Each structure stands twice: as C-alpha cells, then as structure tokens.
Amino acid sequence: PNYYLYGTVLTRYGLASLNHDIRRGNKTILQKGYWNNGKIHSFVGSSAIRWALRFYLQKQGYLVNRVWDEEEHINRLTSEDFDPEKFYDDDIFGFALLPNQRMGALGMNMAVSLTPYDGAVKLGAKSGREKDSTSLHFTEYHATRYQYYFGIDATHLKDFSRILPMIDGIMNLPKVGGSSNIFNYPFCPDSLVFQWTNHFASYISYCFEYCDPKSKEAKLSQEFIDEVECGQIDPSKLWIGGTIVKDLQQLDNFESSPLNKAHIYRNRNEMIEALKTVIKRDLGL
Amino acid sequence: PNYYLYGTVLTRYGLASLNHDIRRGNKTILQKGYWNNGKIHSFVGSSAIRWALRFYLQKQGYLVNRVWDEEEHINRLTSEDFDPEKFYDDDIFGFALLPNQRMGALGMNMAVSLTPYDGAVKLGAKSGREKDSTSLHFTEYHATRYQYYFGIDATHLKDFSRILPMIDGIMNLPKVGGSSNIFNYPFCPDSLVFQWTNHFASYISYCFEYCDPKSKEAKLSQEFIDEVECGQIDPSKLWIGGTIVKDLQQLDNFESSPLNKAHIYRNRNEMIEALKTVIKRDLGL
C-alpha cells in the first residue's frame, strides 16, 4: 500500500539573495528564469533545499553519512559503503556510486519567487581611504516570497518512522544557502498545502500565486480552487494551514464550498500534529 | 541545545540620507527599491550595520581583528591569519581571505524604510560669488523610521559569552554609515521585537507597519499579532520593548489576548536586562 506526502509551501515576505550564479566582474546575479506569463522570477535550486534538510538532519542527532564540516566548509563521508538502513541521509536523499545505487525518497522542485523579478541591486564599496579593486560589488536582491514544492514516498523509506523528522525539518528549515551576512532570509513556512494520499499524482504542485507585482497578498491560485471544486484532488486528503487560512475564511460561500471539508487550521503546529497523527496511524508507527 | 536570537528593530523618526547609491549628474540619489504595496522605499544596507557593530566592538575595547584608523580612514589587520577563537569580529561576522573562511554567527538583513519614499530632495550650493562646476548640488533625503531584521546563532559562536557585547552594541549602535554633516540620523533602537527560541522558525521579520502613508506612527503589523493569537510563536519566547509597548497596552481586550502573557517592557533597558539574564541562564554563563 503505497503512501505519499506532497506539499506546496510558501515562505514569508523578505529580502533575499539566496542562490546567485556566476558573477560578471561586477554584480552577483541571482539566477532567474521564466515562469507563468513569461515574467522572470528568481529561483532557488532544489539542491539548495536538499542541502538545507541534510544540514537540519545532521544538526539534531539523526546519524548522517554525509557530514558537513562547518570549520572546513567541506563534505566528509563517514562510510564509503552507503547503508540506508542506518543513515538517515542515504535513506531519504539516496546516494549514487560507480548496493549500486538508491533513488532518493525525496523529490522537491526549485523554489520560485512568488512575484516577478525587477532590476534591484545593492552597492557594496568597502570602507577605507584606499580604494583598490575588489570594491564596488553589486548584490542583486529580491523582495518577494519563495514557494517550493516537494514530494516523498513514505513507502520507499527503509524506516517508516523517518517521515516525521523530515516534517520537523521542513517546518523548521534552518537555512537555504545564501548571503546570510547581507540578506538573512528565513525560510520557515507561512502557508502550507499538504496532501497525504495513496495516489501517485497530486495536483497541488504550485497553488500559491498572486502576481500583482510588488505585493504580498499571496492569494490561492484560481486554478487550484477550480480543481478542488471539479471533484478530483479530494478535499478529505487536503491539509491547508498558515496565513492563507484567514483569506480562505474571508472568502464568500466558503462555508458551503468543497474546500470547507478539508483539514484547515490557522495554527501551523496544530496542522503538523494532526497530519503526523494521521500518518502514524496509517503507517502503524 | 541549539538556541538562536532573532529580532526586528525600529528606529526613531528623522531625516536620513544614509545609503547614497551611485549618483547621477548633480543629484546624489539615496538607494531605494520596491517594498510592501508596490511603493518605493529607501534601503540602508546591512553591511553598514555590520560595520557599525564592528566599530562598537572596537571602541568598547574588545580585541577585534580589523582595526579602523579613524584619522587615516583606513582599515588595518592586527594579524594576517584570522583566529575566531581570539578575535570577536572574526568570531561573529566571519571572514573570507581568498582555515580560510567562517560562516559567521550574525546574519543581518537590510534596513527598510517604514514609510514610502516620496522623492524629497535638498539643494546644496557652495557659498561665495566665485562659482565653479562644483558650486551647487542636490542631495536626496528621507524622513522615515528605519527597520531591519537580524538573526544570530548562539551555538555557532566560538565563545558563547560573545553574545552579550553584540546585544549591547545593537542597543547602543554607533553611527550607521551616512551623511552625518547634513543628515545626522540616530540609528538607536526605540522599539524591539526579540525572539529567543530553540526552534529556528521565525515569524517576527518586518513586523512593523505604518498607520498612515506619511506619518510617524509605527504600529505593530496585523500579521504578527494575528499569528501570536493563532497559537504559534510562543509568548514566553517573545520579547517586545520600546514605544510600541504603549500602543499595545492601549489596544482593546489586551488583558485577554495572548500578547498579555509575553515579555513586554516600556523601558528597553529593563527588557534587555531580562533577556540577557535569560540568555546567561540558558547558555551557562
């Protein structure tokens, strides 16, 4: 009996220059690409969020094969023969080699800035009477919210109890690799759309969408609501939590809409407790 | 454990021109960008506040690897090799010379203007009938309260006792890089929202909003209060002090809201003393 847990999570509003890409002498370009309507949005690589989860798992017990030496800023590997039955990271994120391999039990898309990117940069000349090179750096930044989508096959896990630490990690995501010195951007969720179903396909990949450039309302996308009303994407398996709950409860006719009978909580921790109880009951933990 | 300190700080009201960007023609544009509601706001960079903290640590008598010669306006290195064990600035702010690098405990974000920037400008001209190309000039200024977000990792500090001087410096921040001759803008805090928790998730980033688009009112944001109501962000781990305390105490039903059972102090020094006592108890100092 396969069981999955998909989720679309939207972060807060803040100033971010997280991932970046190769510089051009001047400027540290935040990487970006096209999105809905062709407007350019700033991205955050999937490997970034996977690295953040690995760091979270390493920071709180939860034995990790791929330990990150903070002092040396390098990745040391404890046991060259990966053992998913023991190491959490090989159980979840998998591994690769020249047994032979193990597909990661976690797959997440790259994070997307909810609002299109406008040309924004930060001057960076370093203090000092002497003005030599390596001064006047430019840091392209973005004042938006980041929304990313993940999916885990809990069945593929070697230890079925490892789903819960991933839930705590995604809720308390420590840090996506970024200019924390200049732009400390928290990545904790502000509005969640979770679904725990035995179906392989979940049509909730990117449900937070507002556009409306330079704004933070972050309404639920119309297409997601239409899909919910259609009959598919069963509301009983839906879990809606965060600040979007307020806007949902301020929607007209919401008391009679099919979205009403979905698990809905303003408090994020109550959502997490209820979902974890359901998952533990279904998986027999 | 893993304790962290997060806070959003609001400054007093005054005329500020602290972050002139690359000037055009005769006018010295101060750096600005978009923010809430799509209105242009003036930004003061986080590197400026990091420099101010470095200067505070230098002045108070702590080691500080980077010495700033005020008369020479130059920066000198006490030792070519960074030693985070011995130097406070290397411990906190990190380094990268290009071991070799440190992550850095203090993670600070930009200083946004609470009030949108209308475009006010000031003309300055050299006196005397003898007039040359450098005779007259225009300097852009803004009358606003500034708000920035910072986050530090107590565990990441090589010496845990170093968290006290950084807090003292934040509450007694020296001049932030700007134009003190004609726009002397004090950056001293007048309203704090501090969180000292073991979880990372932070919901106090930019929790301040204006009552009127052109005013010095500085009320607490609705999202922060609502999130405290809903159940997350435990009031026992909340620390609010400053001028916003009066507005919070004048709110209706305040004695029944969860805001009541949170650490609130009218005097900022008392709240800082209490938070410092809590930190010293938690980290065994």
Add this chain to the structure above:
Amino acid sequence: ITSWLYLGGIVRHARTQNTTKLEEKPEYALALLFVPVVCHYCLLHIPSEDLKERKPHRYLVVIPEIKDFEDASQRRWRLQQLETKQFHVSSLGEAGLLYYSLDDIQPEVAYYQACQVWLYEKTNKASRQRTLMSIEEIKIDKNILITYQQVQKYFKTNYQIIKYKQIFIKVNPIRSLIADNLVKGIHWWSNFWEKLVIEDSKEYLFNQLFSNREGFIIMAENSEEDKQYLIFIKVFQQAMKGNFAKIYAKTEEGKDPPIKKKVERLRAELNYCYDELSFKEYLSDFLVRGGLNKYFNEHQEEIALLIKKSPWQEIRIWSLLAIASYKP
C-alpha cells in the same frame, strides 16, 4: 571520442574514463574531425568591463544548421569577406546575426536560417582552459534580418581604437540591445533610454544615441504605440518654439539671445523635478507659457489622458527627448 572532436563531450566522471566515453561510427568521427572549418569564431566584450582594462578572451563559436551543402559553402565563403573588427561583438545574438548578415535576401523565397552560438570562457582568472558557459539558438527570419540591416545602416559601427599594440574595438551597445530584442521577438524599444542614459551615465552608448538618435526615432516611428508619445513630442516642441519666440521678442537689439543657455536651463529644471506633482506643475506651466498649440488642440483628449495616466518619470524622459530632438 573526446571533447576536442565533439565540443561538450567531456567525460563527466574521470574515474570511469575507459567505459563512459562517447562512441561514434567512423564516418561521423570524420565529420567530427572536419567540423572546425565551417564554424566561425568571434570575440565577446563585456559592456560592464572597460575594454582598455580587459582584453577580450571569451570565444563565441557560431555553428549553423545545415540545409544544403552548397548553400552553407557559399555562405561561409561570403562571410570570409568580413573584417576582424566586425567579429568583435557585444552579444551572442550579435555574432549570430553577423554570421547571417551577408546572406542574400530574396523576396519570393521565404528566408529562414538557424544557427547555434557556443560561448567559451575561462571560469576564473587563472583558468588553464576555456569551458562551455552558454549555448543559445538563433532563428532568423526575413523581418529580423532586414531590421538588423536597418540598424546596422543607421547606427554607427565599432570604433577601432588603436593603441600600443592595442587595437581596441568600440561596439555600440544599442545595436546589440535591439538585436537581442529582435531575437526575443519583443519590441526593439524595450528600454533604450534606460540603457542610453539611466544606465549609461558615461554616455558611451548615449553618444551613440546622439550619433543615432534619428535611427532611434525611426524605429520609434515604426512603433505604433509610440504614436501618442510622438504627438506629445510635437506638442512640447511647439511649446518650446513659443517660449523661444517669447525670448526672441524679449531679446534686445544687438544682444545675442541665450537660446543655448535657455535650453540648458530647461534640461536642468526638468531633471530637478523630483515627484509627480512638481514635474506636472512645471510641464503644465511650460505648456501654458508656450501659447496656442495646434497639435495639443487637435489631440486634446489623447494628450490630456496621456499626461494624466503616464508615470511622471516617463513623461520627463520623453520631454528630454523632445528637447534633444528639437530641429527648427
């Protein structure tokens, strides 16, 4: 085979060099031997980097899609005629268009050519060898190519600065900007002023604007949406004509009227305006002082709505263009 034969065919995992190596039939291996002859090579100049302080080292490789052997041979032999100073470009699309610049244009035949541009650039200062940093596809139709020829004709060519063994080449950024927008399919006038003035305080390409302002106007004329702003340009030109007539009337006999000084004052006053209210105040006052304007009478509602709706920065930009484009 190896990367020297097929560009981009490096072995990702060196420890598996014997097994994970690209394999091909002998005839295709011969083709991979003889690829270098067809593809041309161009040098890329970073606009942000001063060419004086940085000699060009990025190499763009233009590889054309093949439709016929004879057509490709004739095209390559034609492109052999061009000067090296042309090959120095400021964008990948510029090099791609240059590869198809000498192609004959036939109005009965639907022209369509495709080529690949492969960017090779050292990752760092001390990089021993170049690495493939960008591949971009260019599909050129009739309209794009004729527009590019029009841009080449109106806009100035590269300045072949020559110094101590230093034959620097000054590429016009605008040409590239237009070319890029053309390839994008978006309006050429995406944001020329931004690049010409806002970004180009140094007037590196702003001078090109001065040299090619007519060309800019020409393309703007092509732009239908510009129409309203063209009518506003005529309105402001008529208003400044009236103001200059008033100054001429005020001018004493024998004295030289300071029309140049008045124009400089106009530019300074317009640049001084800091918000919507002050700029609109000054614009309306200047229009009133101009006198009876025929154009503003004919297009009353349209110009009024344009003033009411357009952001004041844009109206200031077009007013500055009107001042610069004034020609009695």
Add this chain to the structure above:
Amino acid sequence: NSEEDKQYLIFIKVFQQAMKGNFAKIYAKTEEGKDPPIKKKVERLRAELNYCYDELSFKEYLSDFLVRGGLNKYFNEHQEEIALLIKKSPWQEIRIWSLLAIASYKPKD
C-alpha cells in the same frame, strides 16, 4: 476609460467653456482699438493661477472664473460629478487640470 478620466475630461471642457465666456466678454467690452487683449489676458490668467498658494484662494479664484464665464454646457450636463471632483480632489491637481485646459483651448473657427 475609468470614471475619474471622464470626470477630468469634463472638468477640462468646463474650464475651456468658461474661458470662452470670459474671452467673449473681453471682446464685447473692449471692441474699441485695433484688437482687444487676449494674449495678455491669457498670460494674466496663468499668472493669477500660479499666484494661488493654498486650496482656499485657488478654489475662490476658480469658482469666480467659473461664474464669470457664464452658461457652461459641460458643467450643465454634469452637476454632482464635477462639483464633487472640485471639492474632493487636492487643489494642486485642479491647478494642473486648469492649466492643461488653458493650453488645450481650441479657438473657435
């Protein structure tokens, strides 16, 4: 176009009709001489409009000019809309609108 743009257009036309009335009165009153002053009258009108320093004085001058104009067909067809537009909108924006109407005055052929 939105409603505000329509109101702004009616205000422009109202001001233009008021200027029509005032110029007609000027022509009728000073028919003697080679030509009555209109260009000087337009310059004086602009100077008076720019003289106004706050909402009270500017609104006083605007209302006085409007009544001096005479019957105002554009101001006939729309009473409440234009009246509310005048009372509510900031006086500076009214000054821009009046100056634009001045510059847009189509002479009667």
Add this chain to the structure above:
Amino acid sequence: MIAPLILYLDVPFTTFRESHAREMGKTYPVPPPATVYGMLLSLVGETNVYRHCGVELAIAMLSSPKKSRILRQMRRFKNADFSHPENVIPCYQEILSNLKCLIWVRSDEEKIQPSLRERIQLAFDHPELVRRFGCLFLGESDQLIKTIKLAREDYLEGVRQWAIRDNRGRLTLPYWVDHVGSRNTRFLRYRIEEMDRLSPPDLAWTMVQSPI
C-alpha cells in the same frame, strides 16, 4: 482497434539535457521518447526496461515552454577521495518551465501481456492496487510532475504542436538511452509542426525498441 490511452502532463520544471551535451546541461525542447517511456515504467512500477519494448508513443506539446539556465555545483567522480574539491564542479543546466503536453500510448505492438496501455489504465482506475516506489518525476529526480491524469483529445480543445519524425528535422531525440556510454543509444530526427488535430499523425507514433 481500441482507442489509444491519452495522458495529460503538466510539469513545472523539467530538463531533458541532450546526450552529447555532457559539458553542459543543455536540453531538448521536447521530452524524448526514452524519458517518457522510463517515466511510464516508473508510474506502472516496472523496474525492468525490456518488459515493454514495442510500445508506440506520440507526444502533443500544448504550449511551447521557455528555456532558462541555472547554476549547479554538480558532483562528479573524478577523484577517489569524496572530500577532494575536484569532485565539485560549477556548471550550467538548462530547464524547461511550465511544460504542458499530451501523450498517446499505443501498446498493440507489445508481445507480452498485459501491455503498457492496460497497466496504465488499471493503475488509474485503482491507484491503491498498484505497488511501486519513489515519486513520479519527468527528467531529473527532483523535477516532480504537477498533474498526470487520464484525459481525452478535447481536454484543452485548442491547437496542438506535434513532434513528427522528419528525416530533415532539427531535433535528434533518443528513444532508447544507453546510460553508461553511447553505444546502445538510438536517435531519431524530429520536428515541431503546428497542426490542428485531436489525433496524432502516423509518424508521431515513435515506437520504442531495443537497440539490437
């Protein structure tokens, strides 16, 4: 002849970086038949690759996606030591955004029962019965699929961009991928033709076979 099964695909981000592009993550405009075949095998939980040879696949591309480049510190097997900096290399990889396409599956050429079409159908009627692992993805593992559902020819009732086998086309899509080297990889030359049809034209039925 039983109507071929039709699937509606919607992937937010995807990358089908071409084979010979090993220095760069430069991708095909269209999902190759091999990647689609592998993803269908993953959906039906079929680990063996030789089980469903002969199934014919046709792809209808609903909207042309945008191509964007992203930077990645991809890890490679260059040095024996894992911690050696030679393993990590910074390089660019192209992605395709907002990819919506329709897939036609014709399993009549299969010689082993049940065919792939029957397996996909039975999977969609009874999602709980099918036993598999992993999370469904197109291209790279982290690029999940927003929506894969059973749909008709009229789901968008719009205009379709088909991938047609043309001996003078531009795209060189592989229908069988040899992951180790390039010996067994088999290529077919395609083109994108804009036609208003609710059913694939013959050629579109790219039929997957073993390289032998």
